[PDB]
């Protein structure tokens, strides 16, 4: 039964590992389908966006340090929404895209648009906005796979930029937060049992505050799994708060100006109610839209038919290898449909192609967002959807 399946899975992974040297990447290694969850990475990102109420709280908070704490709460809250066993999202194909929306309790909507912008090396970009609350998020996920011996990792080199568009600094520009991502490990692959862990550092930086949060691994005897430890500081070396606890249990905040005080509950992940994204029905989705593209694989995963899931996934990835060969033959390269290459020196590799002026009427911002790609039920693709973003911005100003 399951014990015999576990032994064969063990054998399959050992035979892959036996040929590798610690320190190498895994870009050329195909992993088996029985470590896959039923969503692509483009959708997995939205797990981290399932607690918008904390972001709405931050936006309404006038004190910069308190506002920073709510942003940290928003960002830390999503990590525990993750598969239970040892599973990873599907690696998206080049040009795959995924859109979603939320119906928020305040009668507003949040919108999400994402695209896989590169395959070698893998990269996806995402855009998230709540126009009627003047909240905008732009980000990139850049996973660099690594074999380390008894462990493997996705070294997470992406980042997220959050802006409160109507909270202006001295320069009149929106208040900006940059947030990085901890690395995702699987440990115990050689002499143990596989377990997923977060590790290394998460950095959160605002105009006047910063936090460095270390995601720790357990010791042999001391410590616990899934522990976090960090400090909220200004940029002059003053420490204001200490964060502690576990990112998938209870996180605590200690006021460092009150030495005798004890850490208070900051985030109890077992008492939070996530808000899940909504998506257009499958009948309206495009060929390379995430849920539609992977539907045959995820259907086979859902019935535990791993021969079929493996064959369906190979067909998709083989087709992509053929498309890449055709690009070389035509002497062209891929360019994303929905994201334009950022200017040099900026935090992000890609940004959504559409110009959305920071202070225009949020109804006009919503209309611009909905023109980018079908998000809401009933919206249809236009012919222009499929042309590259760089060709779309050329016309977005050629008419001007």
């Amino acid at each position: 039964d399951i014990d015999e399946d576990d032994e064969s899975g063990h054998n399959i992974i050992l035979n892959i590992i036996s040929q590798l040297r610690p320190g190498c990447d895994l870009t050329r290694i195909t992993l088996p389908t029985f470590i896959l969850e039923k969503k692509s990475m483009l959708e997995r990102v939205t797990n981290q966006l399932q607690f918008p109420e904390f972001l709405l709280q931050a936006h309404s908070e006038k004190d910069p340090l308190k506002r920073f704490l709510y942003v940290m709460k928003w960002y830390l809250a999503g990590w525990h929404i993750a598969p239970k066993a040892v599973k990873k999202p599907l690696n998206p194909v080049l040009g795959e895209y995924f859109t979603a929306y939320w119906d928020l309790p305040n009668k507003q909507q949040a919108y999400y648009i994402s695209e896989q912008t590169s395959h070698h090396p893998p990269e996806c970009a995402y855009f998230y906005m709540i126009p009627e609350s003047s909240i905008r998020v732009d980000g990139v996920v850049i996973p660099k796979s690594r074999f380390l011996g008894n462990s493997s990792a996705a070294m997470m080199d992406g980042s997220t930029v959050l802006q409160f568009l109507d909270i202006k600094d001295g320069n009149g520009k929106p208040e900006k937060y940059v947030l990085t991502q901890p690395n995702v490990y699987v440990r115990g692959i050689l002499f143990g049992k596989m377990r997923i862990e977060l590790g290394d550092h998460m950095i959160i930086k605002s105009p006047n505050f910063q936090a460095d949060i270390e995601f720790k691994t357990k010791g042999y005897v001391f410590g616990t799994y899934d522990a976090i430890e960090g400090t909220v500081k200004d940029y002059d070396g003053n420490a204001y708060y200490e964060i502690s606890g576990k990112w998938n249990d209870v996180m605590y905040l200690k006021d460092l100006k009150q030495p005798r005080s004890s850490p208070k509950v900051f985030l109890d992940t077992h008492k939070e109610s996530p808000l899940r994204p909504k998506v257009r029905p499958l009948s309206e989705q495009g060929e390379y839209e995430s849920r539609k593209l992977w539907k045959k694989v995820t259907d086979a995963l859902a019935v535990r038919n791993h021969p079929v899931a493996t064959e369906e996934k190979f067909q998709i990835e083989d087709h992509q290898r053929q498309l890449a060969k055709k690009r070389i033959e035509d002497g062209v390269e891929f360019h994303p449909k929905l994201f334009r290459r950022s200017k040099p020196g900026e935090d992000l590799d890609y940004c959504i192609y559409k110009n959305i002026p920071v202070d225009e009427d949020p109804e006009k911002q919503i209309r611009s967002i909905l023109q980018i790609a079908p998000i809401l039920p009933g919206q249809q693709f236009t012919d222009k959807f499929f042309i590259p973003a760089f060709e779309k911005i050329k016309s977005q100003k050629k008419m001007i």
Binding site: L370, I372, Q379, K384
Partner: peptide, 27 residues
Amino acid sequence: VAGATLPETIPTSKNYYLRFDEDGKSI
């Protein structure tokens, strides 16, 4: 340049009452 067609009315918190009941259900 638009990649998608627009709803006949752009949805906002301000026209929510046109799209939902006073009991909160769709119409």
